[PDB]
Structure formats: structure tokens, C-alpha cells
Design a protein around this ligand. Structure first.
Ligand SMILES: [Zn+2]
Ligand SMILES: [Zn+2]
Lengths: 199, 556, 235
RNA sequence: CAGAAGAAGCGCACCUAAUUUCGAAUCCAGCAUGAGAAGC
RNA sequence: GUUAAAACUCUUCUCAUGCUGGAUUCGAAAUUAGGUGCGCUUCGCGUUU
């Protein structure tokens, strides 16, 4: 208490990016025109989930170190509530100290989202067997988020930064093994007072 | 509400759900331009009236700073602005001043660029924008932004009766204009060909400076009708590019001139620089070249051969701005003459007659540009017509279009937690009011009341069926015909005219060739069948075109 | 509100200089042959005149009008027919708490499907209308073991009881749905057991949950309620 | 009233834009205070 | 034809206050804008010593 960490996170998109539309009405509206819609706000901005990527990043790296972390990727897997990932991003007993925001673009969908033609080529006749359309985020598009950590601890910005580097290497969103979602993260941290709004 | 930003000029019209922009452009400091561009904010649309740099020059800067989502304009204004922006970037880089934008900003500005013709009503962000021709240059339109809190007519640069390529009477919203944004203004036509007669009979070359947009084509259309025996020659990559633009966009000109060639051959365009050096060494011809204000350009390699030759003349067929070499020798060992008859802007009278031909007198006429002196006498004459006018050196009613039910909502039930009523009615759009109206309405109004070729609906379906199975008409051809038909009807005429056009050199059209054992003559009858079939589909309404074309291309 | 009287009440608000019936100021709304000159005498011709006469004053280039919730149309191709711009539209007016929407047939079709899915998925066969055998102690032992490890949870016991109130068949339907191994994912809807285990053991405890719950549906309601109330005290 | 810099022709077409899985699971549902006063 | 008959336990006073459906879980896994099409056609390093 008495301080709150604020991590101002700026994404620049290096490769193209795809995070699919989750809303059934928006997806079913766009699947008439494009077979892979992108996640988009109702104010026509691009929405990337960021808490799960930071969680998943830290779970893989801390399981690879050998430090005790639970797995919240396995199906219906109960969080332990004792590990550092449970302290940062949450368990079933205590909520997440890090309130990760959604990565929201600084620009509108008609400026950074393009519709693209993808294929499946027959390996033998070297000829298009399948053609789909997908919406991608252009390279250089800028996204912003605030990772607002209540009850600050010492190793809670660095692990986030560590997780950001993992998201720089592996990617964010979908189609991560076809090359989509390679990104760069620029960080600005500040220990804001918890009573800063009291005038 | 409307904000007048203007260095740069712009008209932001904040409707309350969008930020629609009119004519972001700069005629002539880069930093105060950039700050003034930042002052606009994120705009949803950037509407271009005409393709002059006084109203289009800042459009790539707006896509540098990512302040615009869509740049709508006229299909000839777009093609013009391709050449216009590359020429402006050529001059800006060439002057060694730091470029205000880049060629990538030009490209990306044309990536989000949509194009509609005149009389085509778009509906973006709870608004209705419609273009109407105003006869300044080709693709020059006045803009009707029909909002809910007022209907606004941005006149742009209204044209003149001196124009010969564009139809004179400036098209105006047939309905009601609440607020009107007019631009205050800033018979020697026969004299041009006559003094060319006397000059070239005397043995000189008439070197007419002409602006590459509008002006040079007006001068050439003069010479290409007044049977000037001696040869006529345009000398300017950009001038000949806009000459091919006028010939390509011939359907967007005057109705008489929409039956074409338009320039009656006559001109022998000088393409390469070496040919211009040759013509400068050559000794009676009509050099309709283009540097504008006697600045850098294909004029100046010809300027010297007239400058020393008193027998030749140098006919100034344009306004000659200050700090230009042209005004310096306008205001010299050659004859200098000036013909203001070739003017693309109106005078004050034609602005008043553009303002007295609206259906209902505008509430406020915002004068914006022109000379500040002349804007006063225009203002005084239009206040004399009892019309409120807000000058741009100064800074109010609340018009609100409403929708009336006019149906009795008594007998009303709740089915799925919604209080609903199935109703049959006849919604009407009256000036200022949308009125839903019961059959009682149609009854009363019933008792009160009571080009393109032609083929039957079945003929059109049978022809597109045959040409689809002969593979002349394809799914991509039907897709782009639907795309150009969604921009208007003249764009579709220009599309099918371009595809059907036999090239005079190769005898090759752009139609997809047939499938089978057809012969040459029959192949040409199928190509003409395709041309007349799609041109017969242009006459039909958009909702009749769609169900015809969906049985061949399910996605367009 | 600046008011001035003339031989005429010239209220001058910021929403318009109204005048009910000629001042020298700007007049916005005129609340009105002899009639035509009065309008001609006014400098800065009025935006609207609130009145045969209307025909003429329209041709004098002047707007007329001749004498609740916000109405929003959602339905837009109109036509010139019988002078006025117009379209045939049959639809639905809906009366929301702060607005009146004008929707069309697709909205009602949508809410028809959304209501029909609610209607058809409320009664499931013999509601409130070949089981294996187990001793009562064995049911106590297996429900206690599969309650300690987190397979039979309080939500599972609760949802067992709610469906078993609706009959034996709905309980068999629920238990078959929870035990169902989806062929595309290889997963049952049981909550996974806590504690270190092995996939053969986990599959056998899932089978044990299926057989112990199925052997409990053959028992009497009161006997089922008195077995489960020791685990989920609510139901 | 706005920009401008050895020949020739061409710089166009066509297809495809679909399919599939998943949409569950779990914890909690308590506690505390007041039970009187006044007129007729 | 009852030590009767006659006289409404009536009026006044809000089950209110205190408590956020919260916590856990990334629309992503599978699919190369590929396939078809030749910068070609026309013009002697002349002439001059
Ligand atoms: Zn944990
Ligand atoms: Zn102009």
C-alpha cells in the first residue's frame, strides 16, 4: 500500500499482427466479408489481450528456471495462490495485484487494419487449394497499455519487463508461428501515490 | 458547427459524431503549417472539392500525422492529385527546402482514398455527403454535407461562363441549404486566336504561358476550334498528362463534349526534353506550354527564343502572382499581352446568381477566401440581397431535423420484453423533417397527384450468361464494374469505355478473350455485345444491377 | 431575453431572434400581398416563417412551416413518386424508456430466434415426471473421496440435485453429459482431481464418479438428499 | 489567383477467398442493531 | 320477554441501517497471393579525306 506502480507500455508492431474478434455479433458481421476478423473496439480501435500473454510468458520462464509456479494453462487448472505469478496476476483466493489493461491502438481501424489474402498451395501441383481473407494490423502501428500494480513489490516491474522481452521474442496474438505478432515494447515506470487523486 | 482553420486552409465541420474536413490545402513556414495541422485533430473524412493545391495540398501531411480515415473526392480529382502531389514534392525537394511530407505519404494518402462522382449520395457517420459540379476544373465539385443539425453547401471555387470544357450552370443541392460556404472571387477569347493569326502570319511563335490544370486545356480547346492554320504544340510532361486525363475523363466534362476526340487532334505533343530544345531552335507555331507563372518548367527553354524576338509575342493567359519572374516581365524585347478572359473562377455577379438559384435562400453565407478587399464589396452586394454573411475576420440558430411518427402508438404490446408494434407506412423525407406516414398519407397524395442504350431484363441476363460462359465477362470484370457503378454512373461508363476501347496501334481491347472456335468478326461482335450489355446495365437502378450481377459473382 | 415591442414582440434569445407579428435588427423566425411587403421590409430575410400564401412565399425563396421521446429510424432507398421523396417501408416501432426506435423485419426475426431458443430450451423431456447397483456405504465412500479430491464439487452436487428433482432421466442426461469424452478434445466435463495422479487413475476416478452418481439415481429422493446434504449443506 | 522540366507502341487479364474444434469449471451466500414511546 | 339498550382498543410511528458477483483462464490452433504470359518489334558505324 501507500504507493502504486504504473507501467506505461508502448507497443510498436514490427511484423504484422492478428488477434481475432471474440464478439459473436462483430465476428458474424465480418465473416460475411473476411474470414479472419481482427479484434476491434466499438470506437474502431484494435484490442489485444495482454494479461494472459504476460501470465503465460512468466509461467513458461519461471517453470524453466525451476522456481515454483503453478500452471494456469492446463484445462480447468486451479491456481496455487503461493507462487509469484499468483501474486502478480492472480489466484482464486486473492485477486491480481497487477491490473493489466488491454492493448489499445493509438489509431483507428481504417488506418492500421488491412484485409489480406492468404492461401493453401498444393505441395505437388504448386497451385492454390484454399484462399482465405484475414484482417491484420500493419507494421509500425502503436498500441498502449497501463499495467497498474497495487501493493508494489521489488521484483514486479522486472518480471513484467522480462515477460515483455518474451513477448518480443515469441509474439502476441494469433498466428505466432507463421510470423505474425513480432513486436517491440517500450517501458516507462512510475511509483504513483495511492492518494494522488485526493485534492 | 463549423470551424474555419485558415499557411494551411481547412473547414472542419464537427457534426457531433464525426469530424468531416473540407479542402485541406496550401497555396503560397512549415512548422506553423504543422502546428495548424495538429490543431484540427483526428478527422473521419477529408472531402476534396477540386484538385488545386489551394484545396488539396495538405492531404498527404494529414496521413503522415494519421489524422484522417478516408479521403473522398471526385475520380478525376484523384488522378489529377497523383500528378499534383508528385509535382509538389518534386518542386519542394528540388528547392532544397525540407519536404513537408514524402512520396510515401502520397502513396498512403491514395491508399485510403475513395472516389465518387456528382449526384451520388454517400452515407458515412449519420450524414449525407453529395457532390455537385461547379465547373472550376475537371472533377471540381461543390459539397453538400447534409447533417441533422444543418445542411451545409461548401461551394468551393465556383466556375465561370468563360469555361468551355465544363458545363457552366453550377449544379446546386436541389433541396434546402441552411449554411453556405462560398469563396469570394479573387470577352477576349476571340482575341487569342486572332492575335495568334497576326503574329504567326508575321512569322513569330506565340508562347502562351498556361497553368497545366484547366488553363492549358482551355487554350488548346480554343485553338482546336478556331481553325488556326499554323501548327499547335503543347510542351509540358504535366500539361500533356492532364491532356490525356481530360481525354480519358471525357465523360466528366460538358455534355456536348461528352460525345468523344475532344481536342480535335491539332496538338502535336512534344514529349521529350530534346524535342523541346529542337522546337526552341526551330523557327510559326503555337507553344501552349506550362510552367504556370513563368517559373521553372518547359516554358523556360523556349522563353529565350521569344524574349529576344520582337516579332513573336508572349500572351499572358493567367494571373501572375507576386515574386514571380512572370509578373516582373508582365508588369523586354518581345510583345507582351494579357487575356483575363481565360479565367476559371467566377466574378461577383456569378457568385450572386449561384446564390439566387437555390431552392430556399441560405441563412448564413460564410465568405472564406479571395482578396480581403474584394470580399467586402461582394459582402455588401449580398447583404443588399438581405442575406446574412459572416466574414472570416469575424467569429446562430439551432436548426434540428426531426423525425415525426404521425402514427398512433396506442394499440401496442410487449412480446420479448420490447414494447413493439408492426406498422405499415410510407416514410417521407421533407425539407428539414422526416415524417413516417400511414396509408392515409399515400391516399391523400394519391388523390392529389392522380444516353445509355436499351435492352430488356431477360436480354441482359441472357447476354451476361453467354459472355460468362464464353469467359468474356468474368467475376473480376463484374466485380470492378460493380465497384465503378457504386461510385456513380459516369464512372461505369468510363470503365466500360476504357475496357472496350480498341487501341489504334495494336487493335487490342482490355476485354477478356473468348473461349471456343470463334472467328475475328464474331469475336468483335461479342466484344460490342459486352459493351452494350454493360452500358444497358448502367441505366438500371443499383438495386436492379445487384440481383442481376449476384447470379454470376456472389460477392459483388 | 431581450424583448422589444413594435407596432410585434421581438424576443431576442441566443436560440434565435423570434418575433410574433419590422425592427431594424436581424430577425430569424417570423411568426406571421400586404403580407409579402412586411417580409420584404425586414433586412436579413428570415430563416423560417411560421404562418395559397405558402405557395407564393415559397416562390419568394423563403422556408415555411404550417402548424416527447426522440424518434430514431434504423431502417434507405427512396423515390420521387407523387412529388415528395418517399419509400414504402413496413416495420416495427419500439418504445424504449428514453427513445422510440423504428426497426424492420430483420430485428423481429432476430428476437424471434432469440425468444424461440429460450422457449424450446426450458422443458427437457419428462421433467418432474438399467441403473447400476451400489451399497449405501460404497456411495458414501466414493462421494466422500471424490469430494475431497475436487471431482464431485458443491456445484456438481447442487446441479446433480436440481436435475434429480426433475426426474431420474434428466439426472442420467446430466451425468452422461458431464462424463462425455468429447472425441475432438478427449475431455470430460468433470472438474479435474486435485493431487498428483496418472491418466489411467484419473480416467478411473471419472468412471467412479459416473458409476457412483448413476447408482445414486436409483435410490429414493429422500435418501439421495440425505446422502448429499452431508456434503453440500444447501442442497 | 497556383506550381513546373533518336523515335514509337504496349503496360492488360483470370481463378480462389473457404473449412474445423472448443464455448467449460470452481469458492462464497453470512452477520449485527434496535422490540419502545405517547395521547384519548 | 337478558341489572337491558347505547359506545369500532382508536390515534401517532416507512424493516431501516452497514456489505461492489467478485476471484481464476490470451479467439487461437491448421492453410506459402500461388498459378499462366520471352522487353519484344522497326533502324547495316553511314558519310568524309
Ligand atoms: Zn500460483
Ligand atoms: Zn481552385
Amino acid at each position: 500500500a501507500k504507493t502504486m506502480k504504473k507501467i506505461y507500455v508502448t507497443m510498436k508492431t514490427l511484423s504484422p499482427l492478428y488477434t481475432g474478434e471474440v464478439r459473436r455479433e462483430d465476428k458474424e458481421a465480418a465473416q460475411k466479408r473476411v474470414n479472419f476478423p481482427v479484434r476491434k473496439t466499438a470506437t474502431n480501435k484494435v484490442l489485444i489481450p495482454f494479461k494472459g500473454a504476460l501470465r503465460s510468458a512468466l509461467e513458461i520462464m519461471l517453470k524453466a528456471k525451476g522456481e515454483n509456479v503453478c500452471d494456469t494453462g492446463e484445462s480447468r487448472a486451479r491456481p496455487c495462490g503461493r507462487c509469484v505469478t499468483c501474486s502478480l496476476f492472480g489466484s482464486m483466493g486473492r485477486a491480481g495485484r497487477a491490473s493489466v489493461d488491454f492493448l489499445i491502438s493509438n489509431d483507428t481501424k481504417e488506418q492500421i487494419v488491412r484485409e489480406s489474402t492468404h492461401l493453401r498451395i498444393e505441395r505437388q501441383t504448386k497451385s492454390a487449394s484454399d484462399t482465405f481473407k484475414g484482417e491484420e494490423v500493419i507494421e509500425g502501428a502503436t498500441f498502449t497499455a497501463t499495467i497498474t500494480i497495487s501493493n508494489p513489490q521489488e521484483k514486479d516491474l522486472s518480471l513484467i519487463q522480462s515477460a515483455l522481452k518474451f513477448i518480443e521474442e515469441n509474439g502476441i496474438g494469433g498466428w505466432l508461428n507463421k510470423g505474425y505478432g513480432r513486436v517491440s515494447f517500450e517501458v516507462k515506470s512510475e511509483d504513483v501515490a495511492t492518494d494522488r487523486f485526493l485534492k | 458547427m463549423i470551424k474555419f482553420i485558415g499557411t494551411g486552409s481547412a473547414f472542419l465541420l464537427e457534426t457531433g459524431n464525426a469530424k468531416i474536413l473540407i479542402d485541406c490545402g496550401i497555396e503560397q513556414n512549415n512548422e506553423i503549417i504543422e502546428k495548424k495541422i495538429n490543431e484540427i485533430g483526428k478527422a473521419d473524412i477529408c472531402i476534396l472539392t477540386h484538385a488545386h493545391l489551394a484545396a488539396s495540398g495538405l492531404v498527404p501531411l494529414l496521413v503522415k500525422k494519421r489524422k484522417v480515415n478516408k479521403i473522398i473526392s471526385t475520380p478525376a480529382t484523384k488522378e489529377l492529385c497523383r500528378l499534383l502531389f508528385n509535382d509538389f514534392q518534386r518542386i519542394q525537394e528540388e528547392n532544397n527546402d525540407i519536404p513537408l511530407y514524402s512520396y510515401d505519404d502520397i502513396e498512403s494518402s491514395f491508399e485510403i482514398w475513395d472516389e465518387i462522382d456528382d449526384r451520388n449520395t454517400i452515407e458515412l457517420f449519420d450524414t449525407k455527403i453529395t457532390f455537385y459540379n461547379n465547373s472550376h476544373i475537371i472533377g471540381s465539385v461543390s459539397v453538400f454535407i447534409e447533417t441533422h443539425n444543418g445542411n451545409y453547401l461548401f461551394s468551393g471555387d465556383i466556375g465561370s461562363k468563360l469555361q468551355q470544357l465544363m458545363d457552366y450552370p453550377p449544379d446546386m443541392p436541389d433541396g434546402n441549404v441552411d449554411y453556405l460556404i462560398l469563396e469570394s472571387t479573387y470577352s477576349d477569347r476571340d482575341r487569342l486566336l486572332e492575335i495568334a493569326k497576326t503574329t504567326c502570319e508575321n512569322g513569330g511563335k506565340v508562347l502562351i504561358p498556361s497553368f497545366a490544370i484547366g488553363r492549358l486545356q482551355e487554350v488548346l480547346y480554343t485553338f482546336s476550334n478556331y481553325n488556326f492554320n499554323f501548327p499547335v504544340y503543347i510542351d509540358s510532361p504535366m500539361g500533356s498528362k492532364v491532356t490525356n486525363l481530360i481525354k480519358e475523363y471525357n465523360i466528366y466534362l460538358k455534355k456536348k463534349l461528352r460525345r468523344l476526340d475532344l481536342f480535335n487532334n491539332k496538338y502535336i505533343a512534344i514529349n521529350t526534353s530534346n524535342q523541346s530544345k529542337e522546337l526552341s531552335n526551330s523557327k510559326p507555331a503555337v507553344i501552349i506550354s506550362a510552367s504556370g507563372m513563368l517559373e521553372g518548367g518547359r516554358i523556360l527553354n523556349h522563353l529565350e527564343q521569344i524574349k529576344n524576338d520582337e516579332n513573336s509575342t508572349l500572351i499572358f493567359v493567367g494571373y501572375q502572382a507576386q515574386n514571380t519572374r512572370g509578373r516582373k516581365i508582365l508588369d523586354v524585347r518581345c510583345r507582351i499581352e494579357k487575356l483575363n478572359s481565360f479565367s476559371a473562377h467566377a466574378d461577383q455577379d456569378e457568385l450572386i446568381d449561384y446564390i439566387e438559384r437555390l431552392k430556399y435562400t441560405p441563412y448564413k453565407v460564410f465568405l472564406v477566401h479571395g482578396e480581403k478587399e474584394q470580399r467586402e464589396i461582394l459582402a455588401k452586394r449580398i447583404i443588399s440581397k438581405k442575406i446574412r454573411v459572416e466574414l472570416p475576420e469575424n467569429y446562430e440558430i439551432l436548426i434540428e431535423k426531426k423525425v415525426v411518427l404521425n402514427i398512433n402508438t396506442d394499440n401496442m404490446c410487449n412480446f420479448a420484453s420490447y414494447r413493439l408494434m408492426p406498422f405499415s407506412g410510407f416514410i417521407v423525407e421533407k425539407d428539414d423533417r422526416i415524417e413516417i406516414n400511414d396509408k392515409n398519407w399515400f391516399d391523400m397524395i394519391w388523390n392529389e397527384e392522380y444516353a445509355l442504350p436499351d435492352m430488356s431484363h431477360d436480354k441482359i441476363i441472357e447476354n451476361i450468361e453467354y459472355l460468362f460462359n464464353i469467359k468474356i465477362l468474368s467475376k473480376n470484370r463484374i466485380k470492378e464494374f460493380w465497384e465503378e457503378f457504386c461510385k456513380g454512373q459516369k464512372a461505369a461508363i468510363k470503365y466500360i469505355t476504357q475496357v472496350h476501347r480498341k487501341n489504334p496501334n495494336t487493335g487490342r481491347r482490355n476485354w477478356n478473350p473468348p473461349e471456343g472456335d470463334f472467328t475475328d468478326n464474331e469475336i468483335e461482335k461479342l466484344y460490342e455485345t459486352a459493351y452494350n450489355t454493360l452500358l444497358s446495365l448502367i441505366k438500371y437502378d443499383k438495386n436492379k444491377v445487384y440481383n442481376i450481377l449476384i447470379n454470376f459473382n456472389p460477392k459483388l
